[PDB]
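Materials and Methods. Structural model of PawL-Derived Peptide PLP-29. The 8-residue sequence of PawL-Derived Peptide PLP-29 from Steirodiscus tagetes was retrieved and submitted for structure prediction as follows.
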Amino acid sequence: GYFPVGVD
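The predicted structure was written out as tokens:
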């Protein structure tokens, strides 16, 4: 849910 979009 962090950067970049896709990483958790």
